[PDB]
Write an enzyme that holds these catalytic residues in place. Structure first.
Site, PDB file in Angstrom:
ATOM      1  N   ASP A   1       0.394  19.521   1.449  1.00  0.00           N
ATOM      2  CA  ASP A   1       1.550  18.664   1.675  1.00  0.00           C
ATOM      3  C   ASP A   1       2.346  18.368   0.408  1.00  0.00           C
ATOM      4  OD1 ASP A   1       3.421  16.822   2.566  1.00  0.00           O
ATOM      5  OD2 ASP A   1       1.965  15.650   3.714  1.00  0.00           O
TER       6      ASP A   1
ATOM      7  N   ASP B   1       0.360   6.374  -0.146  1.00  0.00           N
ATOM      8  CA  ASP B   1      -0.111   7.180   0.977  1.00  0.00           C
ATOM      9  C   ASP B   1      -0.827   6.363   2.050  1.00  0.00           C
ATOM     10  OD1 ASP B   1       0.379  10.116   0.137  1.00  0.00           O
ATOM     11  OD2 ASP B   1      -0.777   9.368  -1.574  1.00  0.00           O
TER      12      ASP B   1
ATOM     13  N   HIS C   1       5.791  15.788   1.373  1.00  0.00           N
ATOM     14  CA  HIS C   1       5.777  14.322   1.354  1.00  0.00           C
ATOM     15  C   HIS C   1       6.070  13.709  -0.011  1.00  0.00           C
ATOM     16  CE1 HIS C   1       1.899  14.282  -0.661  1.00  0.00           C
ATOM     17  NE2 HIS C   1       1.826  12.967  -0.573  1.00  0.00           N
TER      18      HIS C   1
ATOM     19  N   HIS D   1     -43.825   0.472   2.248  1.00  0.00           N
ATOM     20  CA  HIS D   1     -45.277   0.610   2.101  1.00  0.00           C
ATOM     21  C   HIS D   1     -45.707   1.359   0.834  1.00  0.00           C
ATOM     22  CE1 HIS D   1     -44.115   0.418   6.399  1.00  0.00           C
ATOM     23  NE2 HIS D   1     -45.120  -0.422   6.534  1.00  0.00           N
TER      24      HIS D   1
ATOM     25  N   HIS E   1       6.232   9.203  -2.328  1.00  0.00           N
ATOM     26  CA  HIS E   1       5.949   8.745  -3.679  1.00  0.00           C
ATOM     27  C   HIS E   1       7.209   8.448  -4.479  1.00  0.00           C
ATOM     28  CE1 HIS E   1       1.653   9.365  -3.252  1.00  0.00           C
ATOM     29  NE2 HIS E   1       1.872  10.585  -2.794  1.00  0.00           N
TER      30      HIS E   1
HETATM   31  C1  PYJ Z   1       1.595  16.060  -6.921  1.00  0.00           C
HETATM   32  C2  PYJ Z   1       0.759  15.070  -6.137  1.00  0.00           C
HETATM   33  C3  PYJ Z   1       0.365  15.658  -4.799  1.00  0.00           C
HETATM   34  C4  PYJ Z   1      -0.617  15.024  -4.045  1.00  0.00           C
HETATM   35  C5  PYJ Z   1      -1.004  15.541  -2.808  1.00  0.00           C
HETATM   36  C6  PYJ Z   1      -0.389  16.702  -2.334  1.00  0.00           C
HETATM   37  C7  PYJ Z   1       0.597  17.330  -3.086  1.00  0.00           C
HETATM   38  C8  PYJ Z   1       0.973  16.811  -4.321  1.00  0.00           C
HETATM   39  S1  FES Z   2     -43.618   3.809   2.763  1.00  0.00           S
HETATM   40 FE1  FES Z   2     -43.416   3.123   4.827  1.00  0.00          FE
HETATM   41  S2  FES Z   2     -41.279   3.303   5.254  1.00  0.00           S
HETATM   42 FE2  FES Z   2     -41.533   4.133   3.256  1.00  0.00          FE
HETATM   43 FE    FE Z   3       0.641  11.434  -1.467  1.00  0.00          FE
END
Ligand code: PYJ
Ligand code: FES
Ligand code: FE
Ligand code: PYJ
Ligand code: PYJ
Ligand code: FES
Ligand code: FES
Ligand code: FE
Ligand code: FE
Lengths: 192, 446, 446, 446, 192, 192
Positions: D205, D362, D208, D104, D213
């Site tokens: 982590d 991942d 992992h 509107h 990786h």
């Molecule tokens: C070195 C990449 C990485 C990524 C996530 C966690 C730890 C490390």
């Molecule tokens: S002007 Fe009516 S919904 Fe935005």
């Molecule tokens: Fe990872």
């Protein structure tokens, strides 16, 4: 392709590549495109008898497999790798066609709608049988029914086609290794 | 919904509320009272014959690894790493001495034990208690003539007792034939139906065959083909129906050894089954040898079904109230010639597999029946299974179980749903037993 | 949520909680208190004129079969088999004396009766009580000048009383024009909006037209085109707004007989409507004959909308809180030349059909407004409908209902949502009436 | 589920119920107790530097408009029209003095005020109180060295206090380097994981990396590459882990300034970081200058993560319990040569963007770990985060926070989940504080 | 095709098949492919004025229908079988083009993204009008907008093309019978 | 194309159209189709080393962008319009190929399944470099893995190809402006 170097490539796939990289015949690729486009048209309009009569050889093997998921490093487990979703001779295709055309096939009312998209056509004559034509092509197959049911299939097809009655080229083998292991399309009741 | 009080299945199993096919809260409740409590099909000896062989399987919505142990036994474990819960195995079958997690590299044995942890000494020292970190094991794993079932509930009856009166019918084909093999891999397809829709259909629905499968009967030229379009009723004495305490049941169609197989297999099969039947007469008696070569449509409660002789073997794996993942294997008799086994397997998939033309006939029936269970005006409506009620017997001198001595009826629906309701309203096996102490009397009323 | 106590719509309908467009629990509650209680559009005489003619229609999330009886009446039934709940009819329209289930072959009449059961004698004997197994019938089916509505609730007011003060406005076009025909089949498209978003827009939203439809107004060269991009305000006296006790309401734009139709139909339409208006002056008076050829944007509560003169006819079929299946028909006057009817129908679809360029302008507005109702910080926010509040009248000597004597305002939103809230907080029609005994006073406060 | 009583995270953060990654009711509860309560990343100064510049951002499932004001400040508002709730802004970034609703036509300023209403005088007269109709404003918006965060809860601690002990580690790169810029636009991809899966992975982590990786380490030839396939453990003193009161935490890998970048950037980066480190020694001391050029994997609670030096910047935007929309930006140091900044940005996307080959490693880990949280037998199972427990310290003379003086452990998981549980079981900030008054003691037990 | 034998085939579909199985002209199939690929390119980049100018004949009928679901055995119910999603002459297409280009078409900001895939091209000159070219082709049309909205359309197109101004072949009729009855794409506001 | 009149058309898109409407060479379109079909085949069978060796030039730039959604009327905000999902030289493509082939790429077991559909091929020699071939084509790329994961990608590709070692035409530039802003495919870890 050296499959010792290209570690993800199967022996079968490397062999199929080889047959198309050799003698490229542009006219043959065009004939193949026409053949597959006309086949797809007959199937799309559900002219299944015409498809059998005009496109399918009496000695046909029509095969679609589903391959069990195995480890890439697997080397010991040697039981049946695949099952046959289809593995039909001509009479078995005819049974399926009669099933489609039967007026008590309730699933076919209201009438289904099919649309096929054929791409990536390659063609090469066989080396040993100069009357055997190898044709590779990919298909997207769209099936719509019952208002809001839509199923889309995707596949690569390895075909062999051969001149039969009246000199008409007909399908003598289709092989599809279906790429999705668990079907999300209710069934695979379509002719890829 | 109060599952203690809610009458989802009426007395004698005569009707069920349509909502059972659509209600997601009930589906969640079934995970507990049906799937975590009962025996579920895993695999066959023929698919994991050697030490180290394994497959993955679903048990309800859970996934398990099923592994042949060095001692020849089979153990099954949740496919979930005990560290931070990653899925351990991503393939469907193989052979291995263990499974290594792709997240932090924890290594579990085929026996489920936590065998190795990367840099354990440097990182955990001696503080990691690996003995307490084995994969979560399926409490019960048992075999019925090579067919391997699992159960999460330690309190369940042995598989043989659980099969109850259905075992007697299955034995001629499963045992006395010399044994069956399961031919894999299975076809796998998702349908938009509740798992109970195909389970009830296989357990006791002969009525649908002539009409639902009219086109397949007419086109395939099989042995049951006189029924296409309800053109003909099976004669009196053409078969019977049975059901059992723990829910399993089946139809019996006398002599139908070639089953749904197209005419191209009929002469070969009818010759083979007849020849073995003549041998079995002397061993197990005429009636039981006849059952061997008779077509059984059976559901092993809750979600494993089969057509003997046709050789169709099904798992209806639950996803949600309107979603089921259908696994389809072929069963063959071990002593069949290998070429016949191969053609039988292809024919099972041709008729009832992912592109099974018979199975396709059932699609709309099971999907819409399930989906209608969600619709407002249908939730509280009654699905009827009263055909043949008041004519069933129990304790027959020849045919055991609750039995309807007719080929077409709903006897097996009633026993299936009686067991279902007793489980849904019970907190454990003891309560199921208490709820089932007059099971056959309830089924044979009037 | 406690629907007895929760203020979802504030006093006088001045605002609504945004969650009403997104909350799935409320959607489930609407199935009961809105869709199972109120009158819903089914079809038109012109689509099922002959005995045996039928269509399928949605009523809420339920599907019904709507059938012309031999006696000329119309009856409607749940599209669900009384045996095991399979969907009976899979097509949208046709002609038949009955419907046979594809599962086990039960045959129902066009009158809903269970007429045949395969092999009844052999299977059920005399024990099947078919008289009690007729299709679940829609309790109430009534006609407003050929337009057929259904209601699951036997206690509902007659359709005519339910239309309340809106009937007076609709009659010149629906009755005094000689009658309308519905041109099918409808377009059908799913949008990701709550059904209330387009329902509220059609009931009372003239404010959005110049801005939302700026591009369609500028491109289509229609009669309301001076408004493109809010370039011009409709003059005083350009129209009015109305609403009624049971929720129905509409805007009236004086003389706009060619409506949204592109310039290619404007001269023909303006000539046709003017000619009939001159005849109607003598029959129904000048004011009502003028209303006949005036553009009405109307919602018949809850989910049937229309633009008279433009000829757009809509059903907003509910799927879930953010999903609606839009059915679009064309309405034409019976005595129009056939070639004009054909072009009018195409023009309805051109502008408001599946590829309706006007309708496309509304897509994002209705979809995002609905989807925002799920967002955490917006659930408890207030959607405003206060424009024109304190200037509405009731009991006017010329124009009945709660009326805002201005072309642009939110009068009809207020009456729509007042009825909505009264239904949501009531268990039955008697409670709705009690909650509505001062309906017009509430709407005309301040 | 009763969130006051339910132990979702065990004492000392040693384990978490697997259901936390799958439970939709808990996800809904997190919208309230996590996302509506805590500081969430919006944008950077470098993306909206000039008056009128704006971007859209998610805050939980809500969308906000984040706008540079004329006075140089930044304000943020719900992207929802105050009239009938339509989404105001449909683009991701731009420059404007205001935003007009396409429904509107209501016009809001960059300052959120309702500035114009079409035909206000003719329609509303003087009755529309625009002063009360400004866009719903994000109560708190603060900057950490150009990085702009928002919080819906007025009661939250200032952003700096909220960062707690993590701020000390971030400052050398965020402040003392001369400042960072965020290079947009971000990549955007949906993954089927719970937002906590990548959040926990980035927070703590390191375990992992060598295994998950392996292929990226081996193929990319980066500086941490000796770890591929767990071929080698980082030596003692290779790094440390930390966590903080309000949940934020990180791993520190000493000297790893080239991070995940392929060998093509290693010499240039190692030269650049080393040169700036030599300057910073004199300003902030040797230890802190070393931290500047050390690889930090950090999560700013709840769902903003980063890898400093690698330059990866992540928002894990929650959609549902198993759906997360991943936004990936690059961070660069302002005083880097422009060509290096460009290549660094491309390398961030090459490794961790939509087609990031490291990030792809991942995928299965986070998706299956999350999805398994829905599976029946896993819901009540325990995810383990006990590595290094009993060896953490607090109040160290050099390294602040709860600190594990080892490169690989689960210290930061424990602090992350301790804060998570304290929030989930609390109704407001005061209750969180009460639940956290012995936070470090709990983390350093045994 | 004998439609008495091939029971699922419509008279219309059988007629269309016949026109392509006769005189196959490879050069014509190639010209048709170029024509349709260039048309799709103009549409994909949203050059709607160029599309009108270069691809669309002044006498065009541009028609997309939606057919009501009826029983396969239905023989009595004879009311309107289809509605027109599109049924446009040149001026009506121009209105739609102006609507797309209008700067107050709010739905077009941010700019839409279109990608078209044209396959299965067949071409045949008309028997009676040697200047009328029949072209059949299938389209997959992908429309993406607003971050996460993705709609994919699938259709077979029966076209007639004719040489117009400057000898340029232009569309004089497009007919599409849309295969999905209930659209799941928010609308059909795309030029198939 | 006059982009002042066709207001939705970008300068870049108008320029690309122009190069194909000029000298149409049918033989070139056919060569391009073969080249792209063979490239897609090598990729589909995961012969990534063969793809590099046979299809990719040493001087390649392989680029896929994601463009930020901006107002159609936007004229003031001038910060980076796009990011690079890919922007790879030959060595960087090689890194990605080695990552695919590494036996510890856990995500590749069980083996992935790829199916590519290449359509709408256009080809034109460069005006200034008579050895530079411009090829435009659209791709649908279907990736299936792990039983029930299915991801479908859609894109237009602007390529330059040039004769290299042994006279073999190889890719020297691919540019894709990805049409979906927020990916709903888990990642874009596929070679478009
Ligand atoms: C070195 C990449 C990485 C990524 C996530 C966690 C730890 C490390
Ligand atoms: S002007 Fe009516 S919904 Fe935005
Ligand atoms: Fe990872
Ligand atoms: C004979 C096939 C069949 C299938 C299911 C149930 C009964 C019978
Ligand atoms: C005149 C079109 C229209 C539509 C909806 C509401 C009001 C008006
Ligand atoms: S999740 Fe399996 S090793 Fe960590
Ligand atoms: S479900 Fe309809 S006849 Fe059985
Ligand atoms: Fe069946
Ligand atoms: Fe509108």
């Amino acid at each position: 392709i050296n499959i010792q170097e290209d570690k993800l490539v199967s022996a079968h796939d490397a062999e199929e590549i080889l047959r198309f990289f050799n003698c490229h015949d542009s006219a043959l690729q065009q004939e193949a495109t026409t053949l597959l486009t006309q086949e797809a048209h007959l199937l799309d309009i559900q002219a299944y008898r015409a498809w059998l009569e005009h496109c399918v050889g009496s000695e046909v093997q029509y095969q679609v497999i589903s391959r069990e998921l195995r480890a890439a490093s697997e080397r010991r487990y040697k039981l049946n790798e695949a099952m046959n979703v289809y593995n039909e001779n001509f009479q078995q295709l005819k049974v399926r066609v009669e099933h489609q055309l039967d007026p008590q096939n309730w699933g076919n009312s209201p009438k289904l709608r099919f649309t096929r998209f054929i791409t990536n056509v390659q063609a090469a004559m066989d080396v040993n049988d100069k009357e055997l034509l190898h044709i590779r092509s990919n298909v997207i197959l769209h099936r719509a029914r019952r208002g809001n049911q839509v199923d889309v299939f995707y596949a690569a097809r390895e075909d062999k086609w051969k001149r039969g009655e009246g000199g008409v080229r007909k399908l003598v083998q289709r092989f599809v290794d279906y790429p999705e292991r668990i079907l999300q399309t209710h069934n695979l009741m379509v002719f890829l | 919904m109060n599952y203690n009080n809610k009458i989802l299945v009426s007395e004698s199993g005569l009707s069920q509320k349509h909502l059972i096919h659509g209600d997601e809260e009930l589906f969640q409740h079934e995970l507990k009272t049906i799937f975590a409590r009962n025996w579920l099909f895993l695999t066959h000896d023929s698919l994991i014959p050697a030490p180290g062989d394994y497959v993955t399987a679903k048990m309800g919505i859970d996934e398990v690894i099923v592994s042949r142990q060095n001692d020849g036994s089979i153990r099954a474990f949740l496919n979930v790493c005990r560290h931070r819960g990653k899925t351990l195995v991503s393939v469907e079958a193989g052979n291995a001495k263990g499974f290594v997690c792709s997240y932090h590299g924890w290594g579990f044995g085929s026996n489920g034990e936590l065998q190795s942890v990367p840099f354990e000494k440097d990182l955990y020292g001696e503080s990691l208690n690996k003995k307490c970190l084995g994969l979560k094991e399926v409490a019960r794993v048992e075999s019925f003539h090579g067919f391997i079932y699992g159960c999460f509930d330690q309190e369940a009856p042995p598989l043989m007792d659980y099969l109850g009166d259905a075992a007697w019918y299955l034995e001629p084909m499963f045992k006395h034939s010399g044994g069956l093999e399961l031919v894999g891999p299975p076809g796998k397809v998702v349908i938009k139906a509740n798992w109970k829709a195909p389970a009830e259909n296989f357990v006791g629905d002969a009525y649908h065959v002539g009409w639902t499968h009219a086109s397949s009967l007419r086109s395939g030229e099989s042995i049951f083909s006189s029924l296409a379009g309800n053109a003909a009723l099976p004669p009196e004495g053409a078969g019977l129906q049975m059901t059992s305490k723990y829910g399993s049941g089946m139809g019996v169609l006398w002599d139908g050894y070639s089953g749904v197989h197209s005419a191209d297999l009929v002469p070969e099969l009818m010759a083979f089954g007849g020849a073995k039947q003549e041998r079995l007469n002397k061993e197990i008696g005429d009636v039981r040898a006849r059952i061997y070569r008779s077509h059984l449509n059976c559901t092993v409660f809750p979600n494993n079904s089969m057509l003997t002789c046709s050789g169709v073997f099904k798992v209806w794996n639950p996803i949600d109230a309107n979603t089921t993942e259908v696994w389809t294997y072929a069963i063959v008799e071990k002593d069949m010639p290998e070429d016949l086994k191969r053609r039988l397997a292809d024919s099972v998939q041709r008729t009832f597999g992912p592109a099974g033309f018979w199975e396709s006939d059932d699609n709309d029936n099971m999907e819409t029946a399930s989906q209608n269970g969600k619709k407002y005006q249908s939730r509280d409506s009654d699905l009827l299974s009263n055909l043949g009620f008041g004519e069933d017997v129990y304790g027959d001198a020849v045919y055991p179980g609750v039995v309807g001595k007719s080929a077409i009826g709903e006897t097996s629906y009633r026993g299936f749903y009686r067991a279902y309701q007793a489980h849904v309203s019970s907190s454990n096996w003891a309560e199921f037993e208490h709820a089932s102490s007059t099971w056959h009397t309830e089924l044979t009323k009037t």
